[PDB]
Amino acid sequence: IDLGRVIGELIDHRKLIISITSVFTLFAILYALLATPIYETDALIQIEQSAPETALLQSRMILGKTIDDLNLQIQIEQKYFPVIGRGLARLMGEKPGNIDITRLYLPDSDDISNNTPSIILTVKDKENYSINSDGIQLNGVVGTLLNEKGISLLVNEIDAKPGDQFVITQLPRLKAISDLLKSFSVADLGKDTGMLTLTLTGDNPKRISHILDSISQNYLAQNIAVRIIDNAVTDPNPVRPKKTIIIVIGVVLGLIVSVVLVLFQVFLRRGIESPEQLEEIGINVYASIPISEWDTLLAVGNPADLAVEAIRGLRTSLHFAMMEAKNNVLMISGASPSAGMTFISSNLAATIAITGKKVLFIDADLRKGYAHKMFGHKNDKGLSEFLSGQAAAEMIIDKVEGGGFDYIGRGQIPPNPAELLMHPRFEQLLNWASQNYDLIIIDTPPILAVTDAAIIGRYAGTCLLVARFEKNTVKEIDVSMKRFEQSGVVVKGCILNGVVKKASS
Amino acid sequence: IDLGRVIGELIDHRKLIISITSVFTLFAILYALLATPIYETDALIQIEQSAPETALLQSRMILGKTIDDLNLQIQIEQKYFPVIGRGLARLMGEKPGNIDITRLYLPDSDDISNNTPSIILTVKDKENYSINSDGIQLNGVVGTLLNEKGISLLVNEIDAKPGDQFVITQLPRLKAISDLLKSFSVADLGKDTGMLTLTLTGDNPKRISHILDSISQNYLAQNIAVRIIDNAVTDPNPVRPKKTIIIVIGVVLGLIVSVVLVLFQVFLRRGIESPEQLEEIGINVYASIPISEWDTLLAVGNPADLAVEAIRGLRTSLHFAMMEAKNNVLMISGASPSAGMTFISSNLAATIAITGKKVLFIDADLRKGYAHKMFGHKNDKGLSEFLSGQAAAEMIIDKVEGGGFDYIGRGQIPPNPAELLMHPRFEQLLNWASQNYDLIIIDTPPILAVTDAAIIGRYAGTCLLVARFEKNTVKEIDVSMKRFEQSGVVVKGCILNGVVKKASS
Amino acid sequence: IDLGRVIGELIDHRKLIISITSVFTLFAILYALLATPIYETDALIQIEQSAPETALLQSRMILGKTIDDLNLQIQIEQKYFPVIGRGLARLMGEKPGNIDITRLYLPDSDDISNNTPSIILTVKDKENYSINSDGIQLNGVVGTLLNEKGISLLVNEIDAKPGDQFVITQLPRLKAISDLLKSFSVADLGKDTGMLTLTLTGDNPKRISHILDSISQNYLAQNIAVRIIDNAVTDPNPVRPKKTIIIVIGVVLGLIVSVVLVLFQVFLRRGIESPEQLEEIGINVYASIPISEWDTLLAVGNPADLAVEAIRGLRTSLHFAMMEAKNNVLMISGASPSAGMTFISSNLAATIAITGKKVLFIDADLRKGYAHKMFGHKNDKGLSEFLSGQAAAEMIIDKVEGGGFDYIGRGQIPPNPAELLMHPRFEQLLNWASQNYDLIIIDTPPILAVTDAAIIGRYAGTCLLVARFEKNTVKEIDVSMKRFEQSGVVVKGCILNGVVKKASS
């Protein structure tokens, strides 16, 4: 391999790479702007050791005393239905509300799994609110305590706009202790000094400072039955999410997945890339027709098309190739269907007729031939009707309107096309036509599908294959040439079709 | 690869390398001369340990006491609108001013984000000043305190020229402590001694000394409720920016990016570099025409041009190549447009006519032919009009004024050029002309674009391709030769055009 | 590569290597003999630890007390205008003078940058002196103190010749302390003992001993409110500059830069080195003419020259090469101008005429031909006048005086040389001359520049190229041979010219 090839492949697939990288970067930006910020508060205490004090601070007694003091077993969560509602509310500048609950007691269903009872509180005004646990609706008022339906609740100082909802959960004490212990860290920072740094992370910058102050005070009171140097304060810059590293990771991930996909697609290509691939085997490529981005003939609708220019190049190439041929019959065929045989043949006939030579076009695709549709037709009396014997040699020839050449349609689809094409009346037709016309072009089905082309090619002076640019492979074209030679038909060469411009070439 | 090639490439691209390196060095010099200088002050104290004292010095209690003492929570910044205004003011020798503020209290909006209120003070004279916070204009006087609009301010000892502006911010205490702690360092320097080195970096050489003295005094007073050996002094040589290393890094970065760009451009070149590239394939290069830096013929305006000398070399080469040819018709063609076919053909006709031989020039570029413009014209009755049949063989031939040879213009642009060129009247014209002239030169469109050149080349005794120096590639020229041979036209050889002098060759 | 080639290259470039190495060694010797000597004084004290004492000795309190005691803040420098004046004065045996200043107080301008005020003192005699600070001239006398113009000065014991000048600077205290601390070192030398070695380097062998004694005494007095074993003494042998290592480094640096330059020049050579380089391609080198270090013909002025001997060798080689040639016309040409075509042709004609054969010399360089100047001329009626038709075949032939052969000059420079040379009168001239002379030699312009040589070579029986020894390359000669063959001219071979003797061959 070489650098030029890889750079060309990257240039060709630029749209895919850009789209994938942009999608990944957009997802990264959305996550980094919608993820909830996490603040960190710190405190510094002095040990008058410090190896067992790390375990004493994280023991369930200290944390449990803190949780009992601060009522951390009442989980209040602002209610947003979607997974991005909270982030959108924060971005729009909306101020989150809060409720001070000093007493909560749910009926404690305590089944096998749901060990955490929860209710939903809807704020109707600054004073009253509605409560629903499992569809049971109740009404409560700030101030006076509520003892109804096995539910006890005391709510103070609602701070939210009316219509807001809050999920109130009474999680078990061990769950609260585990949650507190997950986000709480103790370090020595000197490995020998009495200095201990206590760290607590959480999404509420004031609550975490209060929690760490309570932890420190409880530990201090417990020890004297240690010195608090730095009481806990919260860093106003969140520690998570780290937006810049997230976005950089997203961009690099997009680039690497795009490069992997591009390499995978490149290594899985088998189609023909250039005429030199065919010419390595020993197949003369007589032309390369580009894609015409422009039920009518292109050589007639848009005579100045680039594809028609390539076809004129093919015409002047054939005027020299088709010399010293046994007759004036040219047979266009191919390996696979929808390669361009009818396009090539019809347009070539048009470009050769505009130069003043009489041209006959025969649609010998007795199976899926649509030439009569493209030329303007009387569908009666095609090639089939002549071959089966129910027509004459003069009632099957029609004239293309915007063309300048005659044509013979397929006719009705027969049940035995390959056996009709073997009748000697076909050779009689070709011998008769080879005296009233200057050129005869025959369109045929593929050869890798059926065998009609190989029957027709016996009476053809020149035979050319059509290879589609990306679809067919060199193996298919070689197999087709060999199958034609096995049946006694000499293929003059190939015609690459549907070519497009690639920066890797 | 070899050393000579890389040295030649470096010599050829010297201008690009010099420009890029100079731009990078200029940017580095601008940064190193405009970046604000940062001074460093040091102190040395003695510990009568020293592992917890590093944490005690950087604790928020000591720094907070220092900040409360020195009022470091009032941030005063000189106002320069651009990002280089301060550096320019320092370079021009301007003395920065300062204000001693002993009391500031802003209304403390304290919204979600802007936790730091700020005002702008404009100095009108040595005594009075103007204040604007959010468009609210107020006037104040040094001395008497200001208590207006929820704003309290006491300003003493303004030292600046009138018209200067100062941004006064009241940043939060924790922000001030964090900023102080970011630029403050403590080290032991012996890992066992009681000697501690305290270091403080800042842009004001006196303020940092005062701050470090206050830090040391506060720590000393706290401990006795330690010895100060070296009170803080400031090194007058700034520690940042380090100009020499910055400039060296800039120069080396410029050199490496220039070398990378040069290597990238060299590895992405595909055009023809020397006639030997064409002669490897087996194409006889008959000449190499240099660029003529000098609507007129070069072989006439400047007969002593270097390009005309190369064309005379081509003329004497052709006088030997064109022997034993079937007729006296020469066809100049090419692979891509704007390669030099009309330049080469017209100048060659001029140089062959100055030697006393009758020369006919034909502009068979029926699509974009401008020869009549270059020769002085009566645009009627060109090649088109003759081919279509509406003109005679004698009404199309005109004479070049400063030339010495006849010519035939294209005429009106036809709708079917390639089909006009196939008429036998073209061959009749060439056969008639081959008896009244000594040489016939035909200019043609490219062959990779259209097929006109391949129609004309049937009646041409000699055919030569023109390859542009850097534009065309060996692949294009090989494809063109093969496409000409496929149509029965033997190409004698090639003509390299637009050559320039490269030190890598 | 092989050892013989590199040894030969080194022998060939011996002069360059010797010159570069001698220049580098001279610069090294000048630096090592003009750099100011730096003495080192040492002391040894005993610590009754020693880790904090290193920091206590280098603290600003001890050094500041020393500087206040010894007045190290008054910098007195002997005035020499050049950067080598002090070294020259020391080498000539001149004794430096000194002044004891016990009180200095400058006005202390104290601007942004110049924090060190300074004055210049000129010694008029043993008693009085002149002072200038910024053009303000004052006169002072030893003894009585000076208090004038904001300048206070007390000068004692001037020791210098009259007319000497001294720069007196009052540098800031911190600058003096930093300078003292830069050259002062403390070491333990045992890592555990109480022994401390104090080291001080400076250019005054007595002052540094006094300074180190003061440092030790101040530290000793401070500690007792330690034992001084070895009071400071100065090593009379300077520690810097180390002359021998400096000179060795200079010599080795010169050798390596010379070798690098030689290798770079060798790898950048492209010219022809030996006739075998041409004979590899398949070009017969018929001679190799050496440089003639000796407006006249060499074969006439100095017939026994070595170059004329090589030309006689070429003559006897040609007498065999030029057999079976179609006529007796020899054409000397070349690739690039100033290769030796006229030298070779004229001298060859002289050496062939001295053997009794009639020789005609033609100067067909119609552009820059100076043969008539070298032969003695009547500049009228040259080749140009004959070709244009305004002269006869007998009025253009002249006789060389000290030669023995006839010649034809170019004549007036024409506007169309290449088109004059194509006239059939040139062939008529050559055919007429080929019957009255035994040999005809034609001198021509280069072929890589113009095409005249290729026009003339059609009528030349033998054609030889001239390649200059170092200038031309094998590529140029191959291109020239190919361009001659493209135009139908067979080049018999080459002639290497301007050869010199190289030890690498």
Ligand SMILES: Nc1ncnc2c1ncn2[C@@H]1O[C@H](COP(=O)(O)OP(=O)(O)O)[C@@H](O)[C@H]1O
């Ligand atoms: N170079 C081309 N540019 C534009 N359209 C093309 C080109 N080649 C084929 N086609 C069109 O795509 C369709 C498939 O080609 P077609 O020749 O009809 O199939 P088949 O090869 O099986 O006979 C057709 O409608 C044809 O007009």
Ligand SMILES: Nc1ncnc2c1ncn2[C@@H]1O[C@H](COP(=O)(O)OP(=O)(O)O)[C@@H](O)[C@H]1O
């Ligand atoms: N060696 C050259 N030196 C100077 N100008 C040139 C040279 N070769 C081509 N040109 C000029 O650049 C333009 C493009 O060349 P041209 O021959 O006219 O295009 P084309 O090859 O398509 O016929 C022209 O204006 C031509 O005069």
Ligand SMILES: Nc1ncnc2c1ncn2[C@@H]1O[C@H](COP(=O)(O)OP(=O)(O)O)[C@@H](O)[C@H]1O
């Ligand atoms: N081997 C040589 N020894 C001494 N002088 C030489 C030698 N070769 C050429 N020259 C002199 O150097 C100059 C350049 O050579 P010359 O033959 O005149 O140029 P050109 O090859 O273009 O005709 C001349 O003055 C010539 O006399």
Ligand SMILES: [Mg+2]
């Ligand atoms: Mg079909």
Ligand SMILES: [Mg+2]
């Ligand atoms: Mg053109």
Ligand SMILES: [Mg+2]
């Ligand atoms: Mg000369």
